[PDB]
Design a binder for these strands. Structure first.
Ligand code: NAD
Ligand code: NAD
Ligand code: MG
Ligand code: MG
Ligand code: MG
Ligand code: MG
Ligand code: MG
Ligand code: MG
Ligand code: MG
Ligand code: MG
Ligand code: MG
Ligand code: MG
Ligand code: MG
Ligand code: MG
Ligand code: MG
Ligand code: MG
Ligand code: MG
Ligand code: MG
Ligand code: MG
Ligand code: MG
Ligand code: MG
Lengths: 90, 96, 92, 97, 92
RNA sequence: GGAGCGUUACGUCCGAAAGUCGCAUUGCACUCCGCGACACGGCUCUUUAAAAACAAAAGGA
RNA sequence: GGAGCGUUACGUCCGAAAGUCGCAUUGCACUCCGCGACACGGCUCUUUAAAAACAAAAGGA
């Protein structure tokens, strides 16, 4: 089920929005160009982040290489997104 | 009882709310009496015999008189102060 | 963005301001003349400090040498400071 | 044939900046040495025999060894510390009288 | 428990051995011939002593007679010696 | 059961102190003293007071 | 009313506005959005932001 966009959860919910975005960007940029990182602190979406890679190539490599990577004292759980993100489908 | 009416360097106060703690009491007495003269000492004990009462020692008898007459019946912690002269000199005053 | 001043954080927040300043001078003086050390225990400054050097050269060496240096049992994190405006703000 | 220096849970520090007040010196020493383990005392004096010198008394000997080895020559108030194991408890007392 | 040797403790540890031994001999000879007195200021024996009587009856008397006696400002605690192996072990 | 150990709250001083609640008290001191009541994990020893450690989810200031 | 002032509990530090704490939440989105809590005597000035004094019957470590 690969996809340009990986779904990360089990993230530390105490981290401020833009710090979290920066810290994810630094730790996932190696894998390729990141189009965007979507983070929301609502009840429904805290602890979660969508990283949008330019290439599925980068996303797949990011998923297994960083699966369980320790991040703000919690191992991050990474799957592919179940749909396409807006930017990837426009 | 007949209040002590001999002018004296020290005024004897009673009918004081004895729920107040020593240091608060002394400190609040010094605030409301400092404008009458130099105060040499304020004596407060919470023992059985001495609670509800305070001694305020002025350097000059005139200060005590004006203090007594101005502050008589003053509401102090919801009780009106009763102020007399001390029946005897305080020791710092007898020394002198 | 290198400049005269380093921003240190992950400092042990249970140390008194006067002692924390003298202890920081003790280890950072080797790098250059310290113009000032800014510490406060306010909610905005607690666990953080600014050290201001006469020369930018000193701040840069201080940053790289003392990165992670354990200090009051905590490895300190060092960055270049932002603008004087940002400093004045976090100190009020 | 050359013998290892005998470990001690107390380290002897010298080449210290003599311009620092003793009280501050103690607290600054604590700040850089507490990382190696529990400190029981730091010994400094204004007396003339203790000039530019200090003892840091650790609970465990392993602490003193790690502290000596890691901080040997560490620049402290613009002066590299010289660190060695303390010799004996009598010697510490004589130096502190 | 009746032994010809008694074990004393709560002795002041700053008295030097010979002195402690002769002082002990004076206050105990009156009960019977003392064959020997064992003192040492090692970790195992500082503050304590064994007194070796020729006869058990000498040691039973000294037990109760001299119990709690004040000695260099401290009350003596006297007991029978448990075993000859304990005595020899304490003195090694 | 009993006793010793007062180490610990930010981190100090206390815990035979202190604060609080309830009575009682209108009282002339210079030194201070009316009752009564109201917390504490754990360690050690066993009518003995020694030893060496130790908690803020347990009391005061 | 407004603004500035953070001095005070044993006696030290702290004392919101885009921040903090507590509880709940493992949730697949691309138009904000769970619930609860954040005390405080007084002083000074009058849209200025300065000045120099100050409380534990008022919050936190
Ligand atoms: N860890 C420690 O070092 C330590 C030390 C003391 C107390 N504590 C804690 O305190 C609790 C109670 O202390 P305790 O175990 O000593 O019990 P406790 O204080 O009741 O015992 C004290 C002893 O002194 C006597 N006593 C009682 N009141 C007295 C008074 N006003 N004046 C003189 N003597 C009096 C009692 O008869 C008792 O034998 C313990 O359970 C423990 O939690 C801990
Ligand atoms: N003596 C002094 O030097 C001094 C100085 C400052 C404060 N104080 C004390 O503090 C009290 C309050 O200080 P102030 O008058 O400067 O208060 P303030 O100007 O901080 O505002 C008062 C109240 O507004 C509330 N508040 C803050 N941010 C908020 C937000 N985003 N949304 C809703 N409410 C918010 C806070 O609860 C605060 O207590 C004073 O009455 C005084 O008792 C004393
Ligand atoms: Mg009032
Ligand atoms: Mg019990
Ligand atoms: Mg008990
Ligand atoms: Mg006790
Ligand atoms: Mg603490
Ligand atoms: Mg009592
Ligand atoms: Mg009680
Ligand atoms: Mg107990
Ligand atoms: Mg425990
Ligand atoms: Mg109580
Ligand atoms: Mg108090
Ligand atoms: Mg008005
Ligand atoms: Mg403040
Ligand atoms: Mg204190
Ligand atoms: Mg006070
Ligand atoms: Mg809104
Ligand atoms: Mg909210
Ligand atoms: Mg608060
Ligand atoms: Mg805290």
């Amino acid at each position: 089920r690969p996809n340009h966009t990986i779904y990360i959860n089990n993230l530390n919910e105490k981290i401020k929005k833009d710090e979290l975005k920066k810290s994810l960007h630094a730790i996932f940029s190696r894998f390729g160009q990141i189009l965007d990182i979507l983070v929301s602190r609502s009840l429904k979406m805290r602890g979660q982040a969508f990283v949008i890679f330019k290439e599925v190539s980068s996303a797949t490599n990011a998923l297994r290489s960083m699966q369980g990577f320790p991040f703000y004292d919690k191992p991050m759980r990474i799957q592919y997104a179940k749909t396409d993100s807006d930017i990837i489908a426009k």
